Amino acid sequence: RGYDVTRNPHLNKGMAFTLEERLQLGIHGLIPPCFLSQDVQLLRIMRYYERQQSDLDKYIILMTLQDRNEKLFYRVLTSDVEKFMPIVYTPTVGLACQHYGLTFRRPRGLFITIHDKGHLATMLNSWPEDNIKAVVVTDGERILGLGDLGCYGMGIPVGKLALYTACGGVNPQQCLPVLLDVGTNNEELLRDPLYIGLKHQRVHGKAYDDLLDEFMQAVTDKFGINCLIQFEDFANANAFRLLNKYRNKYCMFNDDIQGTASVAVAGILAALRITKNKLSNHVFVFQGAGEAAMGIAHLLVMALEKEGVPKAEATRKIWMVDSKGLIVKGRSHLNHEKEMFAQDHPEVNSLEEVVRLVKPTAIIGVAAIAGAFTEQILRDMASFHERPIIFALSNPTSKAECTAEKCYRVTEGRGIFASGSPFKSVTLEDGKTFIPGQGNNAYVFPGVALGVIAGGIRHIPDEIFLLTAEQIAQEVSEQHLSQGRLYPPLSTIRDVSLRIAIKVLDYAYKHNLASYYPEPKDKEAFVRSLVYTPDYDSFTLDSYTWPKEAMNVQTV
Template identity: 60%
Template sequence: MGSYHQWFAPWKSRLFECLQISKSVAMIWIDLSTSYHCNRTMEEQTVRVLTNFQKRSNDLDRFIYLISLQDRNEKLFYKVLSENVEEMMPIVYTPTVGQACEHYGIVFRRPRGLFISINDKGHIYDILCNWPERNVKAIVVTDGERILGLGDLGVYGMGIPVGKLSLYTALGGIHPAKCLPILLDVGTNNKKLHADPLYIGRQKGRITGAEYDELVDEFMHAVQRRYGSTCLIQFEDFANHNAFRFLDKYRNKYCTFNDDIQGTAAVGAAGIFASLRITGKKLIDNVFLFQGAGGANTGIAQLLSLAMQEEGATEAEANSKIWMVDIGGLLTKGRPAGDIEGHKAVFAKDFKHMNNLEEMVDEIKPTAIIGASAVPGAFTDRIIKAMGKYNERPIIFALSNPTSKAECSAEQAYALTEGRCMFASGSPFPSYNMNGKTLHPGQGNNAYIFPGVALGVITCGLRHIPDLLFLRAAQRLAELVTDDHLAEGRVYPPLSDIQEVSFKIAVDLAQYCYSNGLASAYPEPENKAEYIRSFMYTLEYESFEPETWEWPGSA
């Protein structure tokens, strides 16, 4: 014991000196920071952020600036984003997030989410336990195989879950600490990334088959075990061959949905519902031609069919109004057996096979064409003119992301139909002036749907999410499009209204969930709006009284 005191004694006085110095430095820092922050309100800080944001020379630099702000002052980031949605959402999400994912090795500053590798198989629950937040309510997960229309970007796809969950907070009011972005790293088949020295993931080909399925199974079970059966798991940008089967596999076991299928379906259907107020047609009186038969378009088609059935049509009658085109051409029953995957087989027609989209439009004469094929320019001038010829008010939706993949531009659609078309796109297009009238193209962005759905699902404690919930969200979104919006060419509310849109969708879904026995949060709140508001993240700084603060023990 004596030797211990002899060793410690020389350091004892020095330790107390260090503590005193630390106390003095801390007090100086507190004085300075208090003085600075007390004289800089959030509004003044917002001006500084906007000035810096606008000085950036390109959108990728603006993206980097905003995620850096998110790292150092999360509340200010969400305040600025929520108050400048129209200007900033295209930066933190589509289309700029696609560019950021392509350059993620350069953009990467710090991990804002959780990377789970195939090498972690057998230990996923332990990894989740290492995440500091114990009460996660919402997870967005991807394996990076089909990022937007850009293909396999592997772990560079992490920008998508991070961006999605940023909108959960900015648009849906879900507390950022309750959100967890996750990327499942099973490798990549992108040869460029195998040779990329900045790539931060597994530089090998993708794991497939049983080993891949076992990883996803373990992940789903680990999430439920760690965070409970009401933790929302949103699947994002999985390849179609996995997206549909995982949705079918997990939808009745977990609180989960696939945004590329169901979120896109809801926002696409909402645009159609709103457009019908202009065309004057009933849903069943339309003929829909879908360019692309992947998750997005198949989801829209399924939801439109469900809506027609709710209006009294049989399933066969509803499906007869929907024509689909994939890489093999028009979906027809005469195509080789096994050529048409199960999720789109119900839309195959007993009709002659065709490969030319222009000829299909002339033959079928659709009232609406909807593109989500990531084939830029698929809607040619001839197709757009034909739509204007066959319809007084044609519906033209070019939904592929990012902008470079759009089937046509808003300018093309308006100019070639003399401003008569109802147009929507996946990524934003500028307004178009025709004959003195300004037309505002609708952006069929899933952000109109998933934040509100997530807010309703989380606050009501849903354990499963039926398709009818997305149909209800689509119908509510269409109801929020006013006559003035339609007169301006909009089929969606302005992006500046999107926070209130998300809130109203959540309230409507809460009413639906409690009325149909889907909610598990009890007792049922009498005032659903007030109940949901009580859960929402505040964008103002907490109020403190720094002048009353004292260093512990200084009295």
């Protein structure tokens, strides 16, 4: 195809094109006279990558590599996914969003604005790839820890899709990052000469609803109803509203809502293997938030009902506390969702007296307030239940409800701890050394996405996410459970994803949800056939001959 082969990141191999490939593709001379394996390209990229003194510069190098040679980009990522996941995605992707340096060389993503309503199909036609299986659309309104970033949020889909392939196995060529720019309510960005967005207040209401309706409709008209559409950092109100709106109409899901809940329930079910106790013999106190503990609570209720527990006594075991006390009948501001987990109980003021009042086996704290798990709570919880469960799932480590070493000291080294912020290994007296598990959304969305794209699943119900949580809980080995670790190491995420992708797939074929008709007998080898690998293809034409008489030139 000539010089254009070296500009296509999905085709360009750089100095890994063999001489025959260079001669056949018509690109001989455009590449230095050096023929390299992908391993040498990887070591050269690593040598250049360690020269940087900041995470933003590492991000720039990785995004440039993705713009040049995407197979080498995913070779880099999958080489050590634990060390590049925080660089191409959160936390570094947000710090790069807020501090864009006109980064993306190759157009990476589709910017669809509110002023394009009615012409979204024409904009989808701008994307070069026309066989798209996954779409990660963002609004830029609630970037993790950064707030409203508007059009700067494009790095978040681009990043998360990079994890669809590095962690899952999704082809990074049927993936499309979309940014719906409806304006931004960020005065810092509005008064900025280097802002690349619309520079007006964020549109809301029926115009916004119609924009997203037409977006889902156009994406499914162009790419099929099986196109997996994931909603990225939308505002929690918009997030949950649109999730309930498009849940059963499109192959849509939300990772900030459902992936987080799945990871939390996976940690809980993994801790169940430490306590050697059934989920039915548990009671949960939460720190409810704006669809943060609500999804975890619903998924945990589903896990309870799975064991043959009716929904009534299943939701009986859930208590919610948020800056006001328990959720009892019509306390002050109970909404239609808080009343679902409302216990008819004396109104309790704060956390300490409810942890004392009902003896909890697991406290799941996601409230974005620090130190909410005071020492006395940990101590009397360890006294109540041997081997309790403490979940400081707040993302900002400065705002975590507890800390690893605090939980392990005050509980005398028998409190199963897990967080969402990186806590280093805690070594205590009595030889008690713990590796506290780190809950990561990359455990759920890559495997679920790979299974959904492999099977052509039409809708992603909550049963799929409970199943994902169960598989992740089964991923942890006994050796890691002894170390107090609740999630499998990220260095195995690929394999984990595969397993999830199979189980999900199984479910979809057991409940008539998958569209892929031939119904593979070996779903393991079927999913393995769709897993994208960074290994280079061969660009040499397949030559063959005919049996010497059918091939005759037939001269007169």
